[PDB]
Amino acid sequence: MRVLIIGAGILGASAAYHLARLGAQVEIIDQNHPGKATLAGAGVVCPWATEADDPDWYLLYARGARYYGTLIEELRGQGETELGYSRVGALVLAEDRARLDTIEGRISRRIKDAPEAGTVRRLGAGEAKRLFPPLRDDLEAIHIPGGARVDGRLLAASMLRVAISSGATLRNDYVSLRLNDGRAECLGSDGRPIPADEIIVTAGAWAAQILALLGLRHPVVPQKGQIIHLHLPGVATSGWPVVLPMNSYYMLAFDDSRVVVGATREDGSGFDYRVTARGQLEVLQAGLGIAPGLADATHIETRVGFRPAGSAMRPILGRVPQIAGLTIGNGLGASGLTVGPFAGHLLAGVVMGEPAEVPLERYSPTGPEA
Amino acid sequence: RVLIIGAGILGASAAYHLARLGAQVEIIDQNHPGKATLAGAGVVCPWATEADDPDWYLLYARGARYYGTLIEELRGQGETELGYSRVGALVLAEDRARLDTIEGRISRRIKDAPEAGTVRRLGAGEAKRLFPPLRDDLEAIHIPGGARVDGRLLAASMLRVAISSGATLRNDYVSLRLNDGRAECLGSDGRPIPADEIIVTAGAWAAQILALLGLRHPVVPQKGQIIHLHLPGVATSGWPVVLPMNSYYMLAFDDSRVVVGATREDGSGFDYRVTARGQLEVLQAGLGIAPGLADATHIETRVGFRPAGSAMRPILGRVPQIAGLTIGNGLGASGLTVGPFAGHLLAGVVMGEPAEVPLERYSPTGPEA
Amino acid sequence: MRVLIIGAGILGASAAYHLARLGAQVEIIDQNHPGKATLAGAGVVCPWATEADDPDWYLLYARGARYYGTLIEELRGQGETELGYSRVGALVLAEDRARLDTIEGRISRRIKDAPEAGTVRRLGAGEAKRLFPPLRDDLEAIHIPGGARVDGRLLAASMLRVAISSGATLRNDYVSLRLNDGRAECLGSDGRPIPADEIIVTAGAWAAQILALLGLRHPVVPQKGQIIHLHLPGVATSGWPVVLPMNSYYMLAFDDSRVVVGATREDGSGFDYRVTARGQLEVLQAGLGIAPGLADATHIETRVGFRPAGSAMRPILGRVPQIAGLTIGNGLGASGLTVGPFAGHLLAGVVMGEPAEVPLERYSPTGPEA
Amino acid sequence: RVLIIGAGILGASAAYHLARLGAQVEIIDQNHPGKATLAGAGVVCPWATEADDPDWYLLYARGARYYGTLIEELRGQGETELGYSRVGALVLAEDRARLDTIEGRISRRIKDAPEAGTVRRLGAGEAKRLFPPLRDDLEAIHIPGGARVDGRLLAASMLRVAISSGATLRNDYVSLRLNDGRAECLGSDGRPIPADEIIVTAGAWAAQILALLGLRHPVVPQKGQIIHLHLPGVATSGWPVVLPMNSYYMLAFDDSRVVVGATREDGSGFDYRVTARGQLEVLQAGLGIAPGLADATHIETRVGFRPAGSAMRPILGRVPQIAGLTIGNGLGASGLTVGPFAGHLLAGVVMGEPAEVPLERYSPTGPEA
Ligand SMILES: Cc1cc2nc3c(=O)[nH]c(=O)nc-3n(C[C@H](O)[C@H](O)[C@H](O)COP(=O)(O)OP(=O)(O)OC[C@H]3O[C@@H](n4cnc5c(N)ncnc54)[C@H](O)[C@@H]3O)c2cc1C
Ligand SMILES: Cc1cc2nc3c(=O)[nH]c(=O)nc-3n(C[C@H](O)[C@H](O)[C@H](O)COP(=O)(O)OP(=O)(O)OC[C@H]3O[C@@H](n4cnc5c(N)ncnc54)[C@H](O)[C@@H]3O)c2cc1C
Ligand SMILES: Cc1cc2nc3c(=O)[nH]c(=O)nc-3n(C[C@H](O)[C@H](O)[C@H](O)COP(=O)(O)OP(=O)(O)OC[C@H]3O[C@@H](n4cnc5c(N)ncnc54)[C@H](O)[C@@H]3O)c2cc1C
Ligand SMILES: Cc1cc2nc3c(=O)[nH]c(=O)nc-3n(C[C@H](O)[C@H](O)[C@H](O)COP(=O)(O)OP(=O)(O)OC[C@H]3O[C@@H](n4cnc5c(N)ncnc54)[C@H](O)[C@@H]3O)c2cc1C
């Protein structure tokens, strides 16, 4: 009766994974809405290049990317060997040499507190193409040996599998909320309450819909994103790194001759689960523009997902003011696969009472407006 | 003016009927996974049902006859593709003993229903002559007048007519609170949604927001999986509905397509998944009476959550002790037949007309303590 | 113009994989017809329990199962580490103890000269359910620790990747054949011949269509097969064994909470690439019959594949009599994922002239029928 | 009597005409991946075509106005679902200059072709009023006679009429053999297929089986990728066809569906794959002139291999020096407009009727020593 988690994406799954290790009874409930963000998550893990230069770097991006090393092994030693993860390195690009210099600097300043990045290095024209053949030969780049990739769906799935293997439960259902005597109550499909000492709301983009039932104003709305998957027949891509043109687009490669190209950021889209023409056109232009070698690659599918985009680019983590037994994790935006796993460790310490490894006040949620 | 929460077959009909009368209708629909109206098979044949509840049957048979008014009212408005057709129905039974008791039930309920046509008990092989895939050793009772419809296309057409008449439709999950004895609607952001009259046709999900008002809404979801088949290059526009009276059924549509009866999974919750045993049961039932479907293409299997109430009879009418709030739900497994006519009844409530049928026996319950 | 391979299934891919490593210039052509057998192969590798006792066929079946040990590491050391292979053991079931005793006899006789099978051990009721939870608790079984499984598509894909990394070429095209001056010619899309010293036809079920152009009578026709893929949300299956109920059906599990169930065997089906109703019913009955735990598992997809089923259960491998520069490999039927990989190694030696590890006279095709 | 190899729009048209003349028809089709007729967009508008070749345009114009006869003969036969509609056509251009030259070329060719109607030059967004997604700043030339059709449904309709008239259809990959000067057809089993006359409408794959007779058939596949869009809740049955005169195009069907011009990939072979650049080219060309399609749903991308010949002129007529063999191929990118009438000619060849059109300029070559 310890913990009840609403939503089992990368964030809700990481919370369960970390809670099950603390001996708590974890009950997970996940509807798996069409457009579940984690099912469409590209899988880039490389914070050192992010242009968002706030103290969130020291707290979430840096700390989160440093934990991937430990997490992958902790999972590997538990029977979970299919995560799609690989420390393949990353290539960062820019249109003009001027902007490419300020980015190299921003990365250099951020290697001190994250040695997993390796030895950052400046590549000349044609050298990035030797690591990612589809790239243009006239592209200079910055190589970050530490940058990795992952299959967002498989990572969350494996974390859930480890939790359920050790006394956790998972079912497919849609639950709601009610405010009882100042405490948070979870109402099942029938309508009866679901006994739980602590509740965690990691409902992603849909969180604002059930939290509003408690008088809360959750400032997280869906940001639609369309992401293209390509197939290179008979092409060994297991060693290819990730590519970050620093223009809201990106692309990476997986072992099964597969290449994924950066997604769109459609604001005010709502929950529009449709593959549109312009959306795919945007991605195809940005992709083939830097990597003409992908021209004759097969188009296998185009996934759609709704990012939990918060008002601020920083997430919303911590216990709810004025409401007992309610914690929420959301707002991961476009960096959820990188921050999600560690953010889940934070929520684990919150509901249990462990000492805060970081100051969550910068991310604490808002209370009832009344 | 009017705010409708939930745009299934029921919420859509209410908007359709109200918009035509000039009321400012604002529709908000979340489109939950498993929206019942999207998964509805579309059989309309109440005279054979084995459930004997007059309060419920009164609307079942009445809503069936209403299709005569609806199809034409929609036809004369640009809407001609609703999948509706008066193709007739075949009622089957395994042992001739049960078939006799059923032939009795049908005649007893046809007393006030000439729309059912002239019933006739068919000899072995006569049912297969109208539905070839059936096995030849099946006696049946033919009800010329039983029809089918594409519930998905019916709700879509009624919404289009409502929007063309000044209604609005947007996607959101809204809630309710008690302000001054009246029902006030809050959007996801939390801002209020001004409305003189609110209607709640949220299907199985209705018991999640009404509970915020102290109401005990006895409607929970009953999952149901339904299989769609395709006979490549086979004319099916004339095939009848088939009701083996064993919780299963099957019907046909124009596009060489055959739909097979659904499951009934109590205590499923909103488990939007296509399970194995669910499809095994449907395929065993279908292929058991219709072995001709063996080599038919399986194109998709849909899932839906029926708004199953504590009692089989629905819940319609204003909420006692709460002003400006009306509820419609509980349709269960007959919402496509009862839905359209019920929306007409919900419209009359918020508009104030005298009830074409006394709604007292369907009214909801007030706030509890 | 060293070698031209027609068809890139598991067999054509294995041949290419072996030839390219020996310096031969390999040109691979594969249309990827709908129903490609390799893309729908279940992936069971456990020959010792087979009811079919054909020495000509069994020689390659048990031989091709042992070759998997070499292949997995060979591919592993080349960057191909995600092949879905695992030595998870197998469970052999039967309804009545009478036939289960007969099966135990066949296995023992064939497990004595096969240490790869491990220590065969007869389990009591409920012990097979301890390894495959969804099974019935009343089932006796025979445990073969050596039984393994693999993802057929990922295996053939990785082989091609290693082959093309070794100077081979892969193209999507439909080619034909004509007989010119007693030697085999391959007609490209334009209709003009394609220069090639040696041709290998691994066209699977479609092989007879183009080989008939040379006066041959290739007795390999398609046998449709429908196979169901299930999903157990939040269930660790990496350690689940294979199940062989010895009733033409079967089922296995993969790492990502996925369970596959035995396939149909539709003779005279032609190239009917449809998912039928009865085909799925039969599989569901067999699966849930012995494994009620799969009842509430998700059904994610149902694949279709045309097995290259030959008149004789033994395959067809070797040069074509009276026709120079032609080599045929086909007839793998329902055991190609086990035989395919090693059978490709045989085809490689044939076309190059190396001595045959196994006398191939018993598998040679027939010559032109004047 | 007659044996047809390949059941695309060309082989189907041939079967539809032969069955009416009382010939015993046996049709065999392998339905290769990328069958051109299954991916054909279906624009019918020869008057605007830029390719001014009289040897090829003789049939293009002649075959286009044959659609009038064909639709009615099919409409008066139970076949009413052809996707055909005389919706008109809009011809656009980059600059007013090129648009002027096109208007002149169009009017010259309608003298003895009144099916085009009254051509009118639009300007300043008048074209957008008939095709909303277009840009407002586009002048155009309206050709009321331009129509569209679903090549997939048309070929099926002809076949059904042919089968209702004693024709047979089978699935197999057949070959050809020289048996004492006669053309003989061998099935997959190797046994011969008795046929008094053989017609080869094998499309791009023809060169492969004809090489078996020592013939050199200069028809190779030209891959083309085509995109289908869906406009949620938008009536498009009345929208005309659009011909930007830039190697691309787009048309609209009844079911809120819009199709965009195809790619032209030479030397592609039978590469049955949907590529990235191919879709980028079509999306750019489509949205470049029709920004309104930005938020349209992408439902499908089809691939087909055009029977592109060395010369744009097709290949029709008996094979020299080989007895009982006839060839039809080379339809290229205009097969849906020329195909139907071309099948009528192939029927006239094998039966012996006089040539309505000069066959000398299309006949194939004989064996090369
Ligand atoms: C196209 C795309 C590409 C991306 N690429 C990257 C990348 O390269 N790197 C990176 O770091 N991040 C990336 N992201 C961001 C990342 O995928 C997300 O930020 C993150 O996965 C969000 O996970 P979540 O669990 O918070 O949300 P979700 O994954 O949406 O989880 C919410 C879950 O809760 C369920 N739920 C909701 N309401 C209820 C309810 N009432 N009852 C029950 N269940 C409920 C939903 O059905 C869902 O399963 C990408 C995102 C997109 C869309
Ligand atoms: C498999 C199956 C087969 C069936 N076959 C038949 C048949 O043959 N004949 C027959 O007569 N009936 C049949 N039915 C029954 C019929 O389909 C349903 O009873 C009917 O569709 C109920 O409609 P509804 O509008 O009440 O519910 P729904 O269709 O579920 O509509 C509810 C809507 O409200 C929305 N909503 C919910 N909560 C909120 C909120 N808080 N805010 C905003 N929107 C919200 C939901 O997203 C949804 O769109 C079948 C049902 C199933 C499942
Ligand atoms: C449902 C199912 C389950 C199975 N389960 C198992 C199992 O558990 N264990 C096991 O050992 N085996 C199993 N098998 C058998 C195995 O999948 C097959 O035997 C094997 O994949 C055959 O490989 P292939 O290369 O001979 O044929 P294919 O994989 O079909 O390869 C033929 C290829 O050649 C191409 N081609 C053909 N003609 C031409 C042409 N003219 N021009 C160009 N390309 C051409 C085709 O497009 C295709 O790509 C199963 C098979 C099925 C159908
Ligand atoms: C993407 C695309 C868009 C197009 N758009 C248009 C348009 O808007 N307007 C227009 O006028 N034209 C258009 N065309 C052109 C038109 O579709 C084609 O020219 C025409 O359909 C060719 O038909 P066909 O019957 O000659 O060949 P196909 O349609 O390719 O038919 C050939 C048939 O023969 C069979 N076959 C071949 N060899 C054998 C064998 N040995 N044994 C048995 N069967 C065999 C094949 O399997 C196939 O079924 C388009 C073409 C493409 C590819």
Side-chain angles (χ1 to χ4, degrees), chain C residues 29 45 92 95 118 235 246 261 287 307 314 329:
Chain C
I29 304 174
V45 181
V92 183
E95 289 299 346
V235 178
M246 302 303 304
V261 187
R307 300 174 238 257
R314 68 180 183 272

Side-chain angles (χ1 to χ4, degrees), chain B residues 273-277 279-280 283-284 287 293-298, chain C residues 274-278 280-281 284-285 288 294-299:
Chain B
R273 283 165 48 263
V274 168
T275 64
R277 180 135 265 159
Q279 291 192 115
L280 175 66
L283 291 168
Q284 279 189 6
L287 298 178
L293 295 169
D295 269 316
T297 308
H298 188 171
Chain C
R274 289 167 41 263
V275 171
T276 66
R278 172 133 278 168
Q280 289 198 108
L281 176 64
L284 290 170
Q285 280 180 11
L288 296 173
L294 301 174
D296 284 324
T298 305
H299 183 180

Side-chain angles (χ1 to χ4, degrees), chain C residues 6-12 29-33 35-45 61 173-176 202-207 210 223-227 250 263-264 304-308 329-330 332-339:
Chain C
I6 297 172
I10 187 63
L11 187 58
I29 304 174
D30 179 71
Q31 177 68 309
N32 196 99
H33 280 88
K36 182 173 179 177
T38 302
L39 308 181
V44 175
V45 181
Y61 196 29
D173 198 3
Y174 189 81
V175 300
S176 195
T202 51
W206 299 265
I210 57 167
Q223 185 189 55
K224 175 175 176 182
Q226 309 183 35
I227 184 168
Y250 53 87
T264 62
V304 175
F306 306 117
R307 300 174 238 257
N330 201 9
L332 299 180
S335 54
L337 303 185
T338 302
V339 176

